[PDB]
Amino acid sequence: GKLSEQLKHCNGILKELLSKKHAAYAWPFYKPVDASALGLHDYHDIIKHPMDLSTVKRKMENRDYRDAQEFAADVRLMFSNCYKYNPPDHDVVAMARKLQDVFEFRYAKMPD
Ligand SMILES: COc1cc(C(=O)N2CCC(N3CCN(C)CC3)CC2)ccc1Nc1ncc2c(n1)N(C)c1ccccc1C(=O)N2C
Ligand SMILES: COc1cc(C(=O)N2CCC(N3CCN(C)CC3)CC2)ccc1Nc1ncc2c(n1)N(C)c1ccccc1C(=O)N2C
């Protein structure tokens, strides 16, 4: 009921984050970090709980999220992992912040 409706809002946000109008800055978050492929041989020493939008999408499709808060927690974990790993002046941090602005402003419109 209310929870289904809230997760519908989450699915709409997720669709938007994956949409072409944000693709120029959303792309680092589309898939799990392949640390070896990117040469980030310290990534898994620093980041204990990787997260990315394709994993959020699979969990949404599979009904893993019991409420909107767990969905939001995973999206914020993905952004926090990016802020944890990188210097504050890094290009990817600016990209994360722009996509997080999109996320937080629409998440705040949650029906209640
Ligand atoms: C698998 O996704 C990646 C692709 C590429 C790559 O080959 N590119 C970059 C994007 C470009 N596309 C852009 C969109 N366009 C529609 C199609 C073409 C094509 C050329 C480069 C990196 C990719 N993955 C990626 N994962 C996690 C990172 C990270 N980078 N950012 C940039 C980081 C960089 C350094 C240190 C940390 C990170 C990081 O935090 N994340 C989340
Ligand atoms: C480590 O970070 C990057 C790496 C590469 C790259 O050449 N790769 C990484 C992906 C590729 N792997 C794929 C799988 N395979 C096993 C082999 C390894 C190997 C070659 C390319 C881009 C990287 N980071 C990056 N950050 C911000 C951008 C930007 N570019 N530019 C290029 C953009 C490209 C498209 C749209 C926007 C941007 C952009 O604005 N920024 C700021």
Curated annotation (Swiss-Prot):
It comes from the Eukaryota. Changing residue 86 to A: Abolished binding to histone H4 acetylated at 'Lys-12' (H4K12ac). Changing residue 38 to A: Reduced binding to histone H4 acetylated at 'Lys-12' (H4K12ac). It is found in: Nucleus; Chromosome. Residues 1-110 form the Bromo domain. Some specific inhibitors of BRD2 that prevent binding to acetylated histone are promising therapeutic molecules for the treatment of cancers or inflammatory diseases. ABBV-744, a small molecule, has been tested on tumors with success: ABBV-744 antiproliferative activity is mainly restricted to cell lines of acute myeloid leukaemia and prostate cancer and is able to displace BRD4 from chromatin. GSK046 (iBET-BD2), which specifically inhibits the second bromo domain, is a promising therapeutic small molecule for the treatment of inflammatory and autoimmune diseases. Belongs to the BET family. The first bromo domain specifically recognizes histone H4 acetylated at 'Lys-12' (H4K12ac). It also specifically binds histone H4 acetyl-methylated at 'Lys-5' and 'Lys-12' (H4K5acme and H4K12acme, respectively). The second bromo domain recognizes and binds histone H4 acetylated at 'Lys-5' and 'Lys-12' (H4K5ac and H4K12ac, respectively). Chromatin reader protein that specifically recognizes and binds histone H4 acetylated at 'Lys-5' and 'Lys-12' (H4K5ac and H4K12ac, respectively), thereby controlling gene expression and remodeling chromatin structures. Recruits transcription factors and coactivators to target gene sites, and activates RNA polymerase II machinery for transcriptional elongation. Homodimer. Interacts with E2F1. Interacts with (acetylated) STAT3; promoting STAT3 recruitment to chromatin. Interacts with CTCF; promoting BRD2 recruitment to chromatin. (Microbial infection) Interacts with herpes virus 8 protein LANA1. This is Bromodomain-containing protein 2. It comes from Homo sapiens (Human).
